Structure 1
Amino acid sequence: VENPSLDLEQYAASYSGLMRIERLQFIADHCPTLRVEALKMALSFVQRTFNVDMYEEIHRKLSEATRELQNAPPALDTAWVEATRKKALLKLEKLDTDLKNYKGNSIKESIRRGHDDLGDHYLDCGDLSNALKCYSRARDYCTSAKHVINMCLNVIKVSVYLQNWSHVLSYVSKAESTPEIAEQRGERDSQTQAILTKLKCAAGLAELAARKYKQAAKCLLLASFDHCDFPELLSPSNVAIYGGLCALATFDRQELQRNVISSSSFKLFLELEPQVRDIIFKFYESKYASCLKMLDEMKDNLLLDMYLAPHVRTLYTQIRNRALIQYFSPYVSADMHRMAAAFNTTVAALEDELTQLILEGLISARVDSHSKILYARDVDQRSTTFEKSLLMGKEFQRRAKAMMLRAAVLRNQIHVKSP
């Protein structure tokens, strides 16, 4: 697991919050050589945002990182670990009394202001389970629909770092149909508040992990270019990579052109990613020799990504499959040698490749391994209806034998008793 062509400077640029620490740490993990770099970049931002839970984690890896780098031929700043810790520990108690003296006031908006400060500084220190609850109680101290949303957005933010995606979606489903179906029209012709652009960033990414790549594409394709850089979940440069490769695999040729290629909504995101754009195009243009050539060499980088690692087979393979169907179906008889180099492989390989797909998949075609050709195999309608009718009738006859004897055995009270 490694790729040299990787820019960590950009990887950190578009992200923030915990997402910076989570992604930087996943890169350092699966990508060595750039573990020298990746652990230094997690360290620096952990020292901001009053964070000890992550420093004790991250810096401990820096030691074992440099330890293994001395096997080819930094120090625990405990002066700082104390400094941020007591600073943070007492800042909790300040915000504690701030909320407790906001609760003594009995103001609806002032207590929600307190709550949102508490959850923030418990997030800061790496504490998730505590940070979680602060926003939950902020539901009670509300009035408007916007207040029940502006908290429900935060509710999700944390349930992403926690990795309970089931509750990510439970509160997106609530937040979506909260203000009478998103204020009806969307704030009268183009909204300054890009809100659902976020709500579908999560509704998708939650499904991404949950294997529903088609349901994920539906939520990631609707992602408009109003929200762009939302660093605490997923960048727009990834929304293109993620939702594009998702649809590609699970979408037919028809929905592609319509809901992917010629749709302006998502078109802007494709512009951002020129390589992702070319593979979606070369699929539809049916120039497969290149289509996969591109995708293979992208696999190296896309694996090192945090959220696109765990679907790198089911997607990549499902696309290959899709194309293999789409290449052949039009032909009644196709030369395998042409199809071979077209799918970056060998003749013999192609032979077995198809074989499996014949049995399982919808490749209704046989193999002539003598001259290495693939012929389309279509059904003799007549034979079919005849064939089965005999067989079904013979099954019906067999059960009729059985339930005639079964009428007899019960009629005679036939059974082997125990005692």
Structure 2
Amino acid sequence: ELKKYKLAARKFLDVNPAPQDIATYGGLCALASFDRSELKQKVIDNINFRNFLELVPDVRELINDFYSSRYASCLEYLASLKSNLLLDIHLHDHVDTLYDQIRKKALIQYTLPFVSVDLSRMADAFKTSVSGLEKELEALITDNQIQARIDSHNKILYARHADQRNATFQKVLQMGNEFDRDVRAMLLRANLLKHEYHA
């Protein structure tokens, strides 16, 4: 246990009664779990804690760049500090999964605003081959997080939008048939028990 992200970061920040450890972690784990509003409240609107964040200017700059859509710079900074970050027990225990979570968060934040995302730009933006990012996108969409369909001809990520009305009609008609068949199976099962009780 005790391997969560948001609750663990909140507990680590809320220390009842060293200073480098307080400056480190914290918002790094919060960004892996907290959404945009929560991260903004806990970092930008946390001047009491942002005073400690000033002691670590690189971490605050990376957090702002993530908030300011500067994925390349913060990703490069984290990669450079990856060897140093995973050398302080707290991150040494689990660093790869945390970095993976930051990566996935970066992707989902990237594809959220646009409708016609271009995968070629994200390739050099994230410093990954088109095939690798394609496989990552398959993994994400198969989890039903990035609601979109990947066009594999011109490498365009056309966003997917539902129609609701057409989806509702298909779901209701399927429900009725399932209810219809079960009720007919209800009558036959009842009569068999009636026949047995007579004997």
Fold-level similarity (TM above 0.5): yes
**1:411 and 1:313 mapped to 2: Cα distance?**
63
SS in 1 for 2:158: strand
SS in 2 for 1:298: helix
SS in 2 for 1:315: helix
**1:299 and 1:383 mapped to 2: Cα distance?**
48
In the TM superposition, residue 316 of structure 1 has moved relative to its aligned partner by: 1.1
**1:362 and 1:290 mapped to 2: Cα distance?**
25
Q: Confirm or deny: 8 A CA contact 1:282 1:291 kept in the other structure.
A: yes
In the TM superposition, residue 274 of structure 1 has moved relative to its aligned partner by: 2.3
- In structure 2, relative to structure 1, the CA distance for the partners of 1:350 and 1:252 (3 Å cut) is same
Mapping of 1:369-384 within 5 angstroms? 369-384=152-167
Counterpart of 2:191? 408
Of residues 295, 305, 310, the one that matches 2:93 is: 310
Q: Does 2:110 correspond to 1:327?
A: yes
In the TM superposition, residue 250 of structure 1 has moved relative to its aligned partner by: 0.3
TM-score (norm: length of structure 2): 0.91
Indicate the RMSD between aligned Cα atoms, in angstroms: 1.8
Structure 1: runs of 5 or more not aligned = 1-208, 228-234, 415-419
In the TM superposition, residue 353 of structure 1 has moved relative to its aligned partner by: 0.7
The number of equivalent residue pairs is 197
In the TM superposition, residue 401 of structure 1 has moved relative to its aligned partner by: 2.4
In the TM superposition, residue 361 of structure 1 has moved relative to its aligned partner by: 3.8
Of residues 5, 8, 29, the one that matches 1:246 is: 29
Larger radius of gyration: 1
**2:171 and 2:164 mapped to 1: Cα distance?**
11
**1:373 and 1:296 mapped to 2: Cα distance?**
28
Task: Summarize deviations over 1:333-361 as a string: whole Å, max 9, x none.
Answer: 11111111111211111111111101104
Q: Does 2:70 correspond to 1:287?
A: yes
Counterpart of 1:211? 3
Q: Which amino acid aligns with 1:322?
A: K
TM-score (norm: length of structure 1): 0.45
Counterpart of 1:265? 48
Counterpart of 2:12? 220
Q: Which amino acid aligns with 2:46?
A: S
Task: Summarize deviations over 1:281-322 as a string: whole Å, max 9, x none.
Answer: 111011111121111222212222212122213321111111
In the TM superposition, residue 222 of structure 1 has moved relative to its aligned partner by: 3.9
Q: Confirm or deny: 8 A CA contact 1:293 1:344 kept in the other structure.
A: no
In the TM superposition, residue 215 of structure 1 has moved relative to its aligned partner by: 0.6
**2:110 and 2:4 mapped to 1: Cα distance?**
25
Q: Confirm or deny: 8 A CA contact 1:335 1:374 kept in the other structure.
A: yes
Structure 2: runs of 5 or more not aligned = none
**1:291 and 1:411 mapped to 2: Cα distance?**
73
Task: Summarize deviations over 1:382-419 as a string: whole Å, max 9, x none.
Answer: 111101001111111122122222212222229xxxxx
- In structure 2, relative to structure 1, the CA distance for the partners of 1:403 and 1:266 (3 Å cut) is same
Q: Confirm or deny: 8 A CA contact 2:12 2:22 kept in the other structure.
A: yes
